[PDB]
Design a protein around this ligand. Structure first.
Ligand SMILES: CC(C)CCC[C@@H](C)[C@H]1CC[C@H]2[C@@H]3CC=C4C[C@@H](O)CC[C@]4(C)[C@H]3CC[C@]12C
Ligand SMILES: CC(C)CCC[C@@H](C)[C@H]1CC[C@H]2[C@@H]3CC=C4C[C@@H](O)CC[C@]4(C)[C@H]3CC[C@]12C
Ligand SMILES: O=C(CCCN1CCN2c3cccc4[nH]cc(c34)C[C@@H]2C1)c1ccc(F)cc1
Ligand SMILES: CCCCCCCC/C=C\CCCCCCCC(=O)OC[C@H](O)CO
Ligand SMILES: CCCCCCCC/C=C\CCCCCCCC(=O)OC[C@H](O)CO
Ligand SMILES: CCCCCCCC/C=C\CCCCCCCC(=O)OC[C@H](O)CO
Ligand SMILES: CCCCCCCC/C=C\CCCCCCCC(=O)OC[C@H](O)CO
Ligand SMILES: CCCCCCCC/C=C\CCCCCCCC(=O)OC[C@H](O)CO
Ligand SMILES: CCCCCCCC/C=C\CCCCCCCC(=O)OC[C@H](O)CO
Ligand SMILES: CCCCCCCC/C=C\CCCCCCCC(=O)OC[C@H](O)CO
Ligand SMILES: [Mg+2]
Length: 355
């Protein structure tokens, strides 16, 4: 036996215990019902299934010295589900990254479920050559009787199509979301300045022209950022007919609507930027905990006869469990950085499920 098998059992349990709680948070808690949290439930389904189906079999092969213990046609099915769940996880993290970017310049639950299912079928068919060709040829899924994807052309093209190019789309759209929110925070500090400057011009004004000019540029700023434009227009026609102090008074009625609207839109930018940061920790620890696998497995293919394929193959049996450990940690990120997730799990650990 191995103490490694003991450590893996913990990693199976943390994966199964943590991700069920994530599925229980998103299914039960009303504050986790947006589209991103629907993807994080679907991601936790991929994590829960990897802990149930893939990760205990990988522990079983640790116990048999990576000689495959099961039926030989269960190898390509096991590598298919292994590659499927993780490929779903990267295309999920890519879909979160992309859909938060598009949600800024397009301002349903069903729409989430069309996207999730599109990401699942993309992953079902990208991973489809593993049972199609590996069940017809044991040399694609076996190496010295070790079940592992043995064809280098599957490992090169599977890493490029299902790990490199979703990570590339992920890291672009994350950088562009970060810049979009920084422009949106800067656009609304700018319109806050144009509103607050013209409100102070109106409260100094002796003549109708200075109220009318300052409300015109207030009507411009509000149009750029919602329905207080009409209130600004109501005050615009008060200034237009010489009623200076009555237009000045109605701009003070603007100052209460402005502070409400600015602060509400200014809280949702810091909601978005908080949420972008938590997703970026999720994105980061996916790639970092799978980087030692993929880079070794491509340095496997580059120095093939040169390097020790039994050392490389032993590193990859360890590096696969760095990436399996990632399945457990997306729930831990949600405890640390989202009070709604931290509270939901808290209540479920106390067996308290009533909303
Ligand atoms: C075993 C390993 C992990 C376990 C789960 C871990 C956490 C929870 C959440 C709790 O609220 C109800 C039980 C439930 C759903 C457990 C059911 C049994 C389980 C699946
Ligand atoms: C981060 C990636 C690190 C942990 C990985 C990626 C590339 C890997 C190397 C790739 C190839 C070889 C040559 C082999 O004969 C011994 C291991 C060694 C030297 C690997 C050690 C671990 C390694 C450096
Ligand atoms: O496909 C995956 C997970 C890889 C993990 N699989 C585990 C089973 N088995 C191996 C075990 C031990 C050594 C091994 N060398 C080669 C392989 C292998 C093949 C195969 C790989 C994936 C896909 C997209 C992502 F974004 C992130 C991970
Ligand atoms: C929320 C819904 C998410 C649904 C998640 C469905 C997971 C099951 C699955 O995708 O199974 C694929 C199968 O292996 C194909 O051959
Ligand atoms: C996904 C495709 C499903 C393919 C199913 C192949 C599994 C076959 C299997 O389990 O074979 C047992 C053994 O080889 C017989 O004695
Ligand atoms: C089934 C999933 C299909 C959904 C779309 C994914 C494309 C299918 C595909 O490209 O995979 C075929 C596979 O290679 C066969 O050998
Ligand atoms: C997955 C995206 C690319 C789809 C390409 C899948 C078809 C090519 C393929 O898998 O060829 C198998 C060959 O027999 C072994 O080298
Ligand atoms: C020539 C083989 C063509 C390769 C086409 C098959 C693609 C294999 C694939 O996409 O799955 C491998 C897996 O992703 C790896 O981690
Ligand atoms: C640190 C990695 C330990 C050395 C790697 C090793 O033993 O590999 C032999 C090499 O392939 C030369 O034939
Ligand atoms: C983190 C989990 C650690 C899993 C390591 C698995 C491993 O390296 O198994 C070697 C074993 O001792 C037999 O070769
Ligand atoms: Mg100013």
């Amino acid at each position: 036996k191995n103490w490694s098998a003991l450590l893996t059992a913990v990693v199976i349990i943390l994966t199964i215990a943590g991700n069920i709680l994530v599925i229980m948070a998103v299914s039960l808690e009303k504050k986790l019902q947006n589209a991103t949290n629907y993807f994080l439930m679907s991601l936790a389904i991929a994590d829960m299934l990897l802990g149930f189906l893939v990760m205990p079999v990988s522990m079983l092969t640790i116990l048999y010295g990576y000689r495959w213990p099961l039926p030989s046609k269960l190898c390509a099915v096991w590598i298919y589900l292994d590659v499927l769940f993780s490929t779903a996880k990267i295309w999920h993290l890519c879909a979160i990254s992309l859909d938060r970017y598009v949600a800024i310049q397009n301002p349903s639950r069903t729409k989430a479920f069309l996207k999730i299912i599109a990401v699942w079928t993309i992953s079902v068919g990208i991973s489809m050559p593993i049972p199609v060709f590996g069940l017809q040829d044991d040399s694609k899924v076996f190496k010295e009787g070790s079940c592992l994807l043995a064809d280098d052309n599957f490992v090169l093209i599977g890493s490029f199509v299902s790990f490199f190019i979703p990570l590339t789309i992920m890291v672009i759209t994350y950088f562009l979301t970060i810049k979009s929110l920084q422009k949106e925070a800067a656009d609304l500090e700018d319109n806050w300045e144009t509103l607050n400057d013209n409100l102070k011009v109106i409260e100094k004004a002796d003549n109708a022209a200075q109220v009318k000019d300052a409300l015109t540029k207030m009507r411009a700023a509000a149009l750029d950022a919602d329905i207080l434009v009409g209130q600004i227009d109501d005050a615009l026609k008060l200034a237009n007919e010489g009623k200076v102090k009555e237009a000045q008074a109605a701009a003070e009625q603007l100052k209460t609507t402005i502070n409400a609207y600015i602060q509400k839109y200014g809280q949702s930018i810091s909601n978005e930027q908080k949420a972008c940061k938590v997703l970026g920790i999720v994105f980061f620890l996916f790639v970092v905990m799978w980087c030692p696998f993929f880079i070794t497995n491509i340095m496997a293919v580059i120095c093939k006869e040169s390097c020790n394929e039994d050392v490389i193959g032993a590193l990859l049996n360890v590096f696969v469990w760095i990436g399996y450990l990632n399945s457990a940690v997306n729930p831990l990120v949600y405890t640390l950085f989202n009070k709604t997730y931290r509270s939901a799990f808290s209540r479920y650990i106390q067996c308290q499920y009533k909303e």
